[PDB]
Structure formats: C-alpha cells, structure tokens
DNA sequence: TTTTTTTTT
C-alpha cells in the first residue's frame, strides 16, 4: 500500500513530512483518518498547512459512496486464518478473519495463550492451509511468551523452527501507557512488509492495575476505548487481524442465570464488549478437553465446539 | 544490572535522585516500568522533571521490538532450580523456573511449607546441581519458619549449616498492608547482589483476615492484584523466581466433578489463578507418600508425580 | 516486654493513649501489628493521629530483614513444656513448644481435657523440669474444670496445692461471641507478668451451636478464622503457648481409607487445620492405655506413642 | 464497572 511519500509530490514541502512521520503518520490512509484537531497538535504544523495536507491526501484517494458490490469485492481479500482445530475453524467460517478484532476469554489453564502461540505458527503457511506468509507482532502483558513452545509446535508442522522464530516480533508492555505507545510505534513497521496478525495477550492486564479504585473508572474506560479504536483502525487499513486474550471474574451478585458456572462475565465493561468483533468463551470440559463457545460474531450465528490442547497446539 | 545512578549523569540533578530512591525506585528498569501518574505522586517531583527523567532513562536502554530470537537468547539465562525430587523436577522441566511465579497449594500436612524449606537449601548450590549461589528472601505469614530444619536438611546436603543460614533473609509479615510494604523494601536489596528466590508462605493468609465480610471483597481482590503485579515485576527485572504457598477450601456446592476430593479449589478467586504462572496441587497419598499434580504451566502439558517428605526435605 | 506507655514520650498526647488502651491495645507490638483501617475504628482517633502513632511505634522497634541467625537466636527462648509422659514429650521434642498452637483431638474419654489439667500443673515448675514459673489462663467451653483434680495431680508432684491453685485463672466462655471477647481482655493481663500457657478446652464447642444450618457456614468459618489469628498473634508476641482441645465426627461418606476407625476427622474444616501448628490424635487403645499420634508438626516427622491416664495425670 | 466464600453427620 502507498506511504506518506506519494503525497510529497502534490505541492507539499518535504519539511514537516518528516514532522508528520515523527507524529506517528506513516501512510496516507492514516492521514485521511486523522482529525484536523489532532493533526494541529503535532507541535509545528500550521492549520492552513494541515488543510493543504488534507487536500493533497484527498487528491490521491477518495472516500465517497461505493454502491455495495465494489465493497463485496474489496472484502474479497479478507484473508481468513486457521486456528488449529478444524472443528473451531469451521465454527468461525475459516478461523480468525483479518481486518477485525477477535477476543477470546476464559478461566485459567483454558487453552488461551496456547491458541496465540499456535496462531503465531499457523500464519507462516501457504494461503491454501489457512494463513499466508505473514509476519506476526506479539505484545505480551504478563510474560509467558515461550519461544520454545513456538519451535516445538512448528516442528509439528514440519516448518523450520528458526525460520518461524525469525518472523515473530516480541514486545513486553510494562504498563498501560507503555502498551499504548507500543501500537503507535507499530503503525510504522506495519506500513512496510507483510504483517498478518497482531496479538495482545491479556489486553486489560495493565489497565486493571493502573486505574484502580472506582472513582477512577471513567478514565480507565476512556483510555481503553482510545486504545481499541486505534487497534481497529490499524486492523482495517493494513488488512491485518487483531487477536486479544481477556480474563474473567466472579459475579457475587446472585445465582439465577443459571446460578452456576461463574467462570464467565469477562472484565472490561461494555466498552470492550462493543468494540470486539468476535467473542469466544473457553471453558474447561472433562479430562483434558475444553469447550469453545462463540458468543458474538457478525458472520455466524452461534455454536459449541470441543478441542484438545496437545503438543502441536490446539487440536482435536 | 545497572542502578538508578547511571542516569545521574544525563543532565539529571542529584537532588531528587535521593527522592526517587526514597520512593522505592532503585534501578533503571523500575523507572522505565513506572507510570508517570505514579511517578508524579512521590511528593516533590515535577511533571516536566518526570519527563526529563523518563527521557534520560529511555536513553540508557530501549524497549522496542526484538524480532524473536534475541528473545530466545535473553531467555537463555532463565536459570531453573531443583525442587528436591528428580521425579517432580523432571515433571517441571528442571524445577522452579526463574523470573516467574509458581504457586503450590493443598490441604494441611502436605509439607508445602516444607518444599519451601528445602528450596531455601537447594539454592546455594553450584548451577550444575539445580540452583546457583543465590541468596534467599523468606516472607512468612504464619510463623512456622524453623532455622533448625534448614540446618538439618543442609547437613543432608553436606553444606555447612552456618553458611546456608547466613544466606537467608527472614521477614515476618504481620498484616497484609505490612506484607505489601515488605516487597517495596525488598526492591532495594534485590538491586545489589545475588538473590535467586523469593518465598511467600501462604500469600493470602493475611488478606483472608483483613478484608472479611463480602461487600468488602472487591477491595481485597484489588489489593491482592496490585501485590501480585509488583511481585511479577520484581521476578522479571531481577531474574529471580517467586514461590507462593496457598491454601484450600471446601466446596459445599455439590458432588458432581467428581463428587469427592474436596481438598481442592484453592482460595484467591481468579485474580490469583490468572497471575500465577505455574500451579501445583499437593495431595495426601498413602502411608507417608504424597501426590503432586501440575495443573497450570506454560511450558509442560500436565502430569502426576509421587514424592516423600523425609529428613532431607522433599525426596522420593 | 515494653508496654504502650514507652511511646507516651515520643510527641504523643496522653489523651487517647487511654483511648487506645481501651480499644484493646496494651503493648507496642500489638500496635505495630494492628492495621490502620482497624486503628481508625476505635471511635475517637484521627487518621493523622493514627499515622503519628504508627511512626512513634516504628521509632521504638523496627521490623526489617533479620538475616537468619538473629532469628535462630531470638528463637532460642522458645521455652518448651513437658506434657507428663516422657514418651510423648520425646515424641514432640520436649513437649508443648511456646509461641505456637497445638491442637489435640479424639473421641470421648480419650484423654484430652485431662492433659490440659496436667499441663496446668506441669507449668509452675523450674525450667529444668519441662516448664517454668508461668501462670496459666484456662478458658473452658464445656464446664468440666475441676480444681480438685488440679490439687490432686499437684500433690503427686509434691507442689503445694494452694500455691498452684493460686496461679491459674479460670474463665467460663458462655457463647462464641463471649469467647472471642475473652481473648481481647486477655491481651491486657498477658501484658504484665509471667503467663506461660493458654488453654482453650473445646475451642469449637460454642461455634458448633451458634452458627448451625449450612447456608450459615461461611460466617462461622470467618469468625473462627479471626479468632485463631488473634490467638496466634498473642502466642507470638508474649512468648506463650496455646493448647486447644478439639472434637471428632463420624464420616458417613464411605469405608475405604481404611474403612474403619471412624473416631477421626476432627471438626472445624480446613480453616482450623491450617492455622494449627501441631496436631495430635488421641485414640483409645487397650485396657486403660491410650495411643497418641502426631499428624501435623513443623519440627518432627511423625510417630506413635502410648500413655496411661492415672492419678498423677498423663503418665506411662 | 468491580469482585468469591465456606463443611456436616
Ligand atoms: N523434621 C521434621 N519435623 C517436622 N515434621 C516433619 C519433619 N520431617 C517430615 N515431617 C512431616 O512432613 C509433613 C510436613 O507438613 P508441612 O510442613 O508441609 O505442613 P504445611 O502444609 O506447610 O502447613 P499446613 O499444612 O498447616 O498449612 C508433616 O506431616 C511433618 O510431620
Ligand atoms: N508444551 C506444553 N507446555 C506447558 N503446558 C502445556 C503444553 N502443552 C499443553 N499444555 C497445557 O495446556 C494448558 C495451557 O494453559 P494456557 O497456556 O492456556 O494458560 P492461559 O489461560 O494462557 O493463562 P492463564 O490461564 O494463567 O490466564 C495448560 O494446562 C498446560 O499445562
Ligand atoms: N481422678 C480422676 N477422676 C476422673 N476420671 C479419671 C481420673 N483419673 C483418670 N480418670 C479417667 O481418665 C479419663 C479422662 O477422660 P477425659 O477427661 O480425657 O475426657 P475428655 O476427652 O476430656 O472429655 P470428652 O471425652 O467428654 O470430650 C476418663 O476415663 C476418666 O474416668
Ligand atoms: Mg495465559
Ligand atoms: Mg504450613
Ligand atoms: Mg472433655
């Protein structure tokens, strides 16, 4: 896709282009998607300058009213991914759709971080297997990222381990304000190359700790909302898919619907429920089998599925 | 590792450096990991001052996107430890991995407060035996720390008792708010020397008593979450391993899965289940043998094991 | 040990010192051990006042990180006691260790509110006999405290009866909530003089009756947990030993391990099993001999023993 | 929006 350099040739000075780029902008879409009020806060751009920039941008590409079918065709390159279990993949329509947010949540030991580790490997595959030749960015908020597991699960897919380990990009988000800047940065390298998947293990880990003490909640929710908005922007303009791992809490409210199974009701209020495109609930079954359930999706209706976490990642 | 003194030479006044240090900060990583909102609450630092501090810090070390392999190499110094029973150690991959949280729980007289006593001794050993030349900090929340047992188990490992007893550091946490400040303090001496293991016997003993009376639960869980977050931060930035002993409760709910064996379902809700890296269940077997089970780990799958608590600590 | 009067001279008003003392506080350790949240509930102390109090306290004594050996030395005055039967005493390491909780349980006539009666007498002895020159507090929850037996067993130890009977302190706990206040009160007179042993005959007698009807269990367990916590605090800060007599129940569950000997499985759930330092099971043997077994101790491993309840208390 | 607790006979 085209960078912010193409518009360097529409009567635009190469002076603040470096300044824009410094402000986080790295392509044109991110320009069109950015608000003037926000563009005029990069400390060194002029309002009239900003208007000239916006006009140059609108020059290259336009955003009007595609009838519907050009939409159906642009969406043809939606580029789904395989999760690692034909049952689940079929329960999603192919798996983790791209340019969208999928959130999976459940109680501990529930095949969570495991599914992310497998995804990291089921992505450097030919498209006719579920994913294709895409790098992967991995932001971890709790540790528990093990390259070994990556190599292991890879061998189970006959892929050279080193090769895979050479197409992941690991970042350890220390605190929420650091996690947020991580995505800003991301917006650059996502702008050049083939990145297919972003992984946020426990998106709301840090937030839960930074803004404690209700009376401080609205601020936490607003920060989280800005974060999710940015994430979705990225996932849409770079044809990449976002995979979020969430947690759960116990409702001491009451036992009525259906009075049991407290390992539900994830954290993050409605702010995160709305912003999330697909919602999946992972529950502990029997023996070493787990039950996956699909709660929120725009494509499918609903279903149940059963999977096993073996030595080759999620399987059947 | 580098202290907070290195950044004393990047256009930083030596005035509040003492003030930072007083606030708990003792190295640079703890600086990078700290939030501005939190840094601006040390009662005597300026917001612009805080920004200059953060910039100086980011000067020394950076946190970007290691591809994956530099990660696999930095993790090479993960420095596992031996538990005292080849069967268990092999069931963990070597034992108590460093820079991570391992929680062991079970009903009484399972000697979980004995595995800690043995760990205290299996740490001042050459690395080719399971542990290496590391001091040990021991925070007890129930008493029951016996130096004698330490000397005894040591002699069983031919180590001079006095020598071992001279590399432990004992602290008696009276109440939860005191327990929390203990770790703050810890962050200092952990900053200089060779500390390999932190032990919290009955992490949730005090919490269970301080915040009683549901309707007061959320506050307890939030305090506990802050605590665990801090603990994991420490365990990660100082290459030290955290070992927590938990308790259990009886579920008067029902008898369905599998209607018996009530000595399970530890205390601490999901807040502690999630934050815990490895979970081990200790159960009473037959005669004087106990059964260890591994419920949650990111590295291994699952397994059973059998051990005996003799006169040389946990054994076979 | 030092009282709460020492801190009356660190810029502290003598106004609420009386108020603190009224709230149960009688020494400094109890101050350091008390939570602010709890201190600010004495109806007439100020939060800033509480902070000044805590600072004054921390002035006198500090609680940091003793390495280990100062611990081994402070523990040198652990001051064990003799039970009355060389076999048992040797099976404990000397007998009832001080600053700790020892619980003995078994079926009726089994020998346990008798061992308490003997302890009452084996305490006013020179230290080189098992105990030393310590008074004794006796809280009975079922009656069955007989001064006669005390005099009798004493004569068998050639001690003047009146002398012994003059160093016991008897309290009849009518109900659970009264039993709890008993210990609060205790905290005062324990603060001045030589008290070596506290005895709670049938700790859980009253609780069993007050909170009946499961659906009311959690509350009972929480009250009991607060109680045990307080007891252990006392036993630790006053170098006194706590001796609890428990009961037993029949498991209509099944007959598998080992299908007989129902006179086991005491009452009090895991809350009491955990909090208990040493656990002893008294069983009926043959003729007039009883079998003692040691189930939970931090010092010794395990063992069996045999004793006889004669006219001089527990003997061989 | 947030957060689980507890055996009996
Ligand atoms: N030297 C020893 N001294 C005391 N007990 C020993 C010794 N060696 C082995 N044991 C036995 O090993 C077991 C250890 O129990 P442990 O210390 O694990 O209790 P815990 O689980 O830590 O505490 P609790 O069960 O009260 O929460 C006990 O049965 C104990 O009697
Ligand atoms: N190679 C392996 N190493 C470790 N565990 C494995 C392996 N293969 C399968 N497992 C098992 O699969 C399960 C994976 O748990 P998972 O990694 O999903 O925890 P999580 O849900 O990501 O983290 P948490 O539950 O603590 O929030 C564990 O029970 C684990 O023991
Ligand atoms: N001087 C004495 N007076 C009464 N009984 C004595 C005496 N000396 C020995 N015994 C016997 O020793 C045993 C003591 O029983 P004990 O006092 O331990 O009952 P307990 O277990 O305390 O109470 P319960 O069993 O009702 O809960 C009884 O069988 C008792 O008859
Ligand atoms: Mg996880
Ligand atoms: Mg213990
Ligand atoms: Mg009795």
Author numbering:
A (entry chain A), B (entry chain B), C (entry chain C): 16 to 330, 334
Verbatim from the authors:
The recombinases Rad51 and Dmc1 are highly conserved in the RecA family; Rad51 is mainly responsible for DNA repair in somatic cells during mitosis while Dmc1 only works during meiosis in germ cells. This spatiotemporal difference is probably due to their distinctive mismatch tolerance during HR: Rad51 does not permit HR in the presence of mismatches, whereas Dmc1 can tolerate certain mismatches. Rad51 and Dmc1 sequences are evolutionarily conserved, with Dmc1 about 45% identical to Rad51 in yeast and 54% identical to Rad51 in human. Both are ATPases and require ATP or its non-hydrolysable analogs to assemble on single-stranded DNA (ssDNA) as the presynaptic complex, which leads to searching for homologous double-stranded DNA (dsDNA) in chromosomes. Here, the cryo-EM structures of Rad51–DNA and Dmc1–DNA complexes revealed that the major conformational differences between these two proteins are located in their Loop2 regions, which contain invading single-stranded DNA (ssDNA) binding residues and double-stranded DNA (dsDNA) complementary strand binding residues, stabilizing ssDNA and dsDNA in presynaptic and postsynaptic complexes, respectively.
Using procedures described previously, we obtained cryo-EM structures of the presynaptic and postsynaptic complexes of ScDmc1 wt at the resolutions of 3.2 and 3.4 Å, respectively, and those of hRAD51 wt at 3.0 and 4.0 Å, respectively; these resolutions were higher than for previously reported structures. All four helical assemblies share almost the same right-handed helical symmetry with about 6.3 protomers per turn and a helical pitch of 100 Å. In our models, ssDNA and dsDNA substrates are located in the central axis of the helical structures and stretched to form continuous triplets with DNA bases exposed for homologous pairing and search. In the ScDmc1 presyaptic complex and hRAD51 presynaptic complex with RS-1 which is a compound could enhance the DNA exchange activity, one DNA nucleotide-triplet in a B-form conformation interacts with two consecutive protomers. More specifically, the triplet is sandwiched by Loop2 of ScDmc1-5′ and ScDmc1-0 in the helical axial direction, as well as by Loop1 and Loop2 of ScDmc1-0 in the vertical direction. In ScDmc1, the first phosphate within the triplet is bound by S265 of Dmc1-5′, Q236 and H285 of Dmc1-0, the second phosphate interacts with G283, G284 and R235 of Dmc1-0, and the third phosphate interacts with R223 of Dmc1-0. All of these residues are highly conserved in hRAD51 (22). ScDmc1, which is highly conserved with RecA, ScRad51 and hRAD51, has similar Walker A and B motifs for ATP hydrolysis and the surrounding hydrogen bonds network for coupling of ATP binding and DNA interaction. The EM densities of ScDmc1 reconstructions are sufficient to build atomic models of the intact Loop2, but several residues in the Loop2 of hRAD51 cannot be accounted for in the corresponding reconstructions, indicating a more flexible nature of Loop2 in hRAD51.
